[PDB]
Amino acid sequence: AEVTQLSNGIVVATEHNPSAHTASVGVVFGSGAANENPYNNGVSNLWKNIFLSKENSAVAAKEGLALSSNISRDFQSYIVSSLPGSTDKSLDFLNQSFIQQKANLLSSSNFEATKKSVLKQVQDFEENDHPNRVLEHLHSTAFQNTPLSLPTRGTLESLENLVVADLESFANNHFLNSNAVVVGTGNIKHEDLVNSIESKNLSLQTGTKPVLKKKAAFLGSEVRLRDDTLPKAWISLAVEGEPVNSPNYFVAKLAAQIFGSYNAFEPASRLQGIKLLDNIQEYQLCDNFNHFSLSYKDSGLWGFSTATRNVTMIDDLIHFTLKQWNRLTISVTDTEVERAKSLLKLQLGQLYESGNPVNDANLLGAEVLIKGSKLSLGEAFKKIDAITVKDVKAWAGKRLWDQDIAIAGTGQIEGLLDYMRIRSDMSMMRW
Amino acid sequence: KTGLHFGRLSLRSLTAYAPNLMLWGGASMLGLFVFTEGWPKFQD
Amino acid sequence: KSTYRTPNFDDVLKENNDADKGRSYAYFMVGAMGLLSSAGAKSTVETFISSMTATADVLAMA
Amino acid sequence: SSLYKTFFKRNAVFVGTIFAGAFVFQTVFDTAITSWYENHNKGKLWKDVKARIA
Amino acid sequence: PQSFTSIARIGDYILKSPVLSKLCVPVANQFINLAGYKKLGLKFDDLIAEENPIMQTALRRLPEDESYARAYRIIRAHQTELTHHLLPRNEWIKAQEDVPYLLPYILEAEAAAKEKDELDNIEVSK
Numbered sequence: 001a002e003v004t005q006l007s008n009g010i011v012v013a014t015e016h017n018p019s020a021h022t023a024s025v026g027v028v029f030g031s032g033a034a035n036e037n038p039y040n041n042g043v044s045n046l047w048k049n050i051f052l053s054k055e056n057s058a059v060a061a062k063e064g065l066a067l068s069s070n071i072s073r074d075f076q077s078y079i080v081s082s083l084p085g086s087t088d089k090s091l092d093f094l095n096q097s098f099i100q101q102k103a104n105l106l107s108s109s110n111f112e113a114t115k116k117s118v119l120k121q122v123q124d125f126e127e128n129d130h131p132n133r134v135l136e137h138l139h140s141t142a143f144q145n146t147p148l149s150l151p152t153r154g155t156l157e158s159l160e161n162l163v164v165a166d167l168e169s170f171a172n173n174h175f176l177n178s179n180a181v182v183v184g185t186g187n188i189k190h191e192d193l194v195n196s197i198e199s200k201n202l203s204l205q206t207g208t209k210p211v212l213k214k215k216a217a218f219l220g221s222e223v224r225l226r227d228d229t230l231p232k233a234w235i236s237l238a239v240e241g242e243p244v245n246s247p248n249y250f251v252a253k254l255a256a257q258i259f260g261s262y263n264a265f266e267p268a269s270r271l272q273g274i275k276l277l278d279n280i281q282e283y284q285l286c287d288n289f290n291h292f293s294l295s296y297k298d299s300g301l302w303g304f305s306t307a308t309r310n311v312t313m314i315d316d317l318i319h320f321t322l323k324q325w326n327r328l329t330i331s332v333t334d335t336e337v338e339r340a341k342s343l344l345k346l347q348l349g350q351l352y353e354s355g356n357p358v359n360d361a362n363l364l365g366a367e368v369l370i371k372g373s374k375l376s377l378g379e380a381f382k383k384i385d386a387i388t389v390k391d392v393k394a395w396a397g398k399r400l401w402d403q404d405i406a407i408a409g410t411g412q413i414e415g416l417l418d419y420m421r422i423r424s425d426m427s428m429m430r431w
Numbered sequence: 432k433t434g435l436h437f438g439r440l441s442l443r444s445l446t447a448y449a450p451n452l453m454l455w456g457g458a459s460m461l462g463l464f465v466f467t468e469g470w471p472k473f474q475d
Numbered sequence: 476k477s478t479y480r481t482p483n484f485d486d487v488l489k490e491n492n493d494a495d496k497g498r499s500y501a502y503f504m505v506g507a508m509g510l511l512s513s514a515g516a517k518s519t520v521e522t523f524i525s526s527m528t529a530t531a532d533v534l535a536m537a
Numbered sequence: 538s539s540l541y542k543t544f545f546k547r548n549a550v551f552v553g554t555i556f557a558g559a560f561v562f563q564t565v566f567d568t569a570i571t572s573w574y575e576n577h578n579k580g581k582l583w584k585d586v587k588a589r590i591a
Numbered sequence: 592p593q594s595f596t597s598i599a600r601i602g603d604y605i606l607k608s609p610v611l612s613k614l615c616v617p618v619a620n621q622f623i624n625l626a627g628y629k630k631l632g633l634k635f636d637d638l639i640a641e642e643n644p645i646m647q648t649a650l651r652r653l654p655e656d657e658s659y660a661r662a663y664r665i666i667r668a669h670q671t672e673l674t675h676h677l678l679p680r681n682e683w684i685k686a687q688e689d690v691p692y693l694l695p696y697i698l699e700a701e702a703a704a705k706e707k708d709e710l711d712n713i714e715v716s717k
C-alpha cells in the first residue's frame with residue numbers, strides 16, 4: 001500500500017492495487033458548495049447532473065465505461081471506471097466530453113430537461129428525508145452569513161433563476177489546472193498513467209480561482225421547524241469542532257467514539273459498553289442516536305443527532321446526554337479510552353480499505369488538494385495509540401466546558417425547552 | 432482486574448471527586464466561616 | 476422564502492464575539508450578587524437570634 | 538484569556554468564594570460607614586462633649 | 592438483603608459435611624413445623640418479598656401454569672387469615688410438595704446482575 005504524487009504542470013496521484021479487478025480514473029477540483037454565493041447556489045449540483053445525463057452516459061456505455069460524480073462543501077469529482085485493460089479509453093472520454101467540448105452538453109434541449117429533474121429531487125428531499133435535512137439546517141444556523149452555510153444541493157428558490165450563462169461563468173473561475181488533481185485507483189500503475197497524459201498535452205486553463213473574503217465563524221443559535229403532523233421528533237446539536245490540519249484532529253474523533261451510535265431494535269446494540277445507555281433504556285428515551293466529528297478546511301462541528309417517538313420526555317434525553325459530556329473534563333476513566341481506541345481503528349480501517357475504487361478516488365483526491373500528500377493508515381494508527389486520558393481532559397476543557405451550542409429540530413418538538421435551559425447544562429455547578 | 436465496586440460509591444470515582452472534597456468539605460467549612468460570628472468564639 | 480435564509484440579527488450582534496470575554500463579565504455580575512446576598516442573609520439571622528439573649532434590665536442585676 | 542478558570546469555574550471554590558469574600562466584607566464595610574457617620578456628626582457626640590466637660 | 596447466592600453457599604457447605612448435617616438438619620425440621628405457613632396452604636417461596644428488581648425478573652420468567660397456582664394459594668391464605676381459622680387438615684401442604692420452585696430463576700438473575708456490575712467498574716492493563 002503506497003501512494004505516489006508527481007507534478008509536471010499537472011498534479012497526478014495514484015494508489016496501485018494489483019489484486020483489484022477494475023480501475024478508476026478521474027479529476028477532482030478544489031471548489032465545493034462553500035465557493036458559491038446565495039444567488040448561484042446549486043450550480044455545482046447542476047454540473048454533476050449534466051455530466052451524468054443520458055446522452056453522455058450512452059457514449060460511455062458503448063465503450064464499456066461507467067460514470068460517477070460527488071458534490072461536497074470543499075471539493076467535487078468526476079470519475080470514469082472501466083476494466084483494467086481499457087484505461088486509455090477512459091482517459092480519452094474525460095478529454096473529449098469534459099475538457100475540450102462543452103457546447104454538446106450545454107444545448108438548450110439538454111439543459112431544460114436536466115433542470116427539471118434536479119428540481120424534483122430537491123423537492124422530494126425537503127419533504128421526506130427528515131434526518132438529513134435537519135443536519136443541513138444545523139450547518140445553516142451555526143455558520144450564518146458565511147460561506148460554510150450554503151446547502152450542497154441548493155434551494156428551490158435559487159435553482160429556478162439559473163441559466164446556461166451561470167454555469168459557464170462558474171466553470172471559467174474554478175475548473176482550472178491549479179485547482180485540479182488527476183487521480184487513479186484500483187488496478188493501474190503510476191508510470192502508465194503519467195505517460196498516457198504526457199503522450200498528449202492536456203491543460204485546462206492558466207490562472208487562479210477567486211478568493212472569498214469572509215472566513216468561517218461559529219455562532220451560537222437555533223432554528224425550529226415544528227410539524228405536528230409528523231410521527232417523530234428529529235434533533236441535532238453541536239459545538240464548534242476541529243478543521244483539517246488540526247493537531248487535535250484524532251483526539252476529537254476518539255471523543256465521539258466514546259459515546260458512539262445506538263439502535264434500540266438491534267439486540268447487540270443494546271449491550272455496548274457505553275454508560276449513557278443505562279439512563280436511556282430505563283424509560284426508552286429514543287429510537288437511535290449517533291455522534292460525529294466533522295472537519296472542513298476552516299472549521300468543524302462536534303455533536304450528535306437523534307430520533308424519538310417519546311415526545312413527552314425529550315427534556316430528559318437532552319439532559320442525560322449533556323451530563324455525560326461533562327465527564328470528559330472531570331472523570332473519564334482509562335478503560336473507556338482503551339475501548340474507544342480499538343473501535344476507532346476498526347472504523348477508520350473499514351473506511352479506507354473497502355473494495356470500491358470509486359470511494360478510494362474521492363478520498364485520495366480530497367486529501368492531496370489540501371495537504372499536498374496523503375497520510376498512510378499505518379501512521380494514523382500510531383497517533384491514535386499515543387493518546388492518553390490527560391489529552392482527552394485537556395481537549396474537552398477547551399472545546400466542551402461552558403461553550404456555546406447550535407440546535408436544529410423538526411417534527412413534534414414542543415417538549416424541547418428553550419436555549420438557556422440547554423446552554424446551562426454545558427457545565428456542572430459541582431466543579 | 433477489578434475490585435470492590437462500592438455499589439455506587441465507586442472509588443475509581445471517589446478520588447475522581449474527592450480532591451475537590453478538600454474544597455467541598457471546604458465549601459461548607461467556608462460556610463460556617465460566615466454564619467457563626469454574631470457572638471464571640473474563636474477556634475483554629 | 477427559503478427557510479435556509481436566516482433573518483437579519485446585525486443590530487444586536489457584537490463586532491467581535493470573543494467567547495472568553497462575554498462569559499467573564501456575565502459571571503462577574505452573578506458572582507457579585509451571590510456574594511452580597513450571603514452577607515445580607517447572615518446578618519439577618521444574627522439580628523433575630525441575638526434578640527433572645529438577656530435584656531438590658533436583666534444584665535443590670537448581674 | 539482565562540479569567541473564568543478558577544475565579545468562577547471551579548464550583549467547590551466558587552460557592553466557596555461566594556462565601557469566602559463575604560466574611561472579610563462585613564468588617565471593612567462596618568468600619569468605613571461608622572467612620573463616615575461620626576465625622577459627619579462631629580462636635581455633637583458624647584465623646585466630643587466629655588472632652589471639654591472634664 | 593442477604594442474597595440467595597450467599598444463603599446457598601452457607602447451606603450447601605453444611606449439607607455436605609456429615610457431622611454438621613446431623614446437628615443442624617433436625618433443628619431445621621422443627622423450625623419449619625413451628626413456623627406454620629403450611630397450615631395456611633403456602634409453600635416457602637410464596638413468602639419471599641417481591642418488591643425488588645431481581646424478584647420481578649424471576650416472577651416474569653415463571654411458566655404460566657405455575658403462576659396461576661401461586662395466585663390461588665396467596666388468595667386462599669388471605670381469606671383464611673381474616674376468618675382467624677386454619678385450613679382443614681387434608682388441605683395442608685405436605686413436606687414432599689414444599690419444593691423450591693422459584694429458586695433456580697432467582698439464582699440465574701442474580702448471577703447476570705453480578706457479571707454486569709463487574710464489567711461496568713473494571714480495570715485494564717497493557
Ligand SMILES: CCCCCCCCCCCCCCC(=O)O[C@H](COC(=O)CCCCCCCCCCCC)COP(=O)(O)O
Nearest residue numbers: 420421424425429505506507508509510512513516548555
Ligand atoms: C417562589 C417564587 C420565587 C421567588 C424568588 C426567590 C429567590 C430565591 C431563589 C434563588 C434564585 C437563584 C437560584 C440559584 C440557582 O440555583 O441557580 C443555579 C445557578 O447558580 C449559579 O451558577 C450562580 C449562583 C447564582 C447566584 C444568584 C444569587 C441569588 C441569591 C438569592 C437572593 C436572596 C433571595 C442553577 O441555575 P442554572 O440552571 O441557570 O445554572
Ligand SMILES: CCCCCCCCCCCCCCC(=O)O[C@H](COC(=O)CCCCCCCCCCCC)COP(=O)(O)O
Nearest residue numbers: 469511512513514515516517518519520521522523563567
Ligand atoms: C425575614 C426578614 C426579611 C427582611 C426584609 C428586608 C427588610 C429590611 C429590614 C432588614 C432588617 C434585618 C437586618 C437589619 C440589619 O441590621 O442588617 C444590616 C444590613 O444588612 C442587611 O440585612 C440587608 C440585607 C437584607 C436581606 C437581603 C436578602 C438576604 C436573603 C434573604 C434573607 C433571609 C434568610 C447589617 O447590619 P449589621 O450586621 O450590623 O446588623
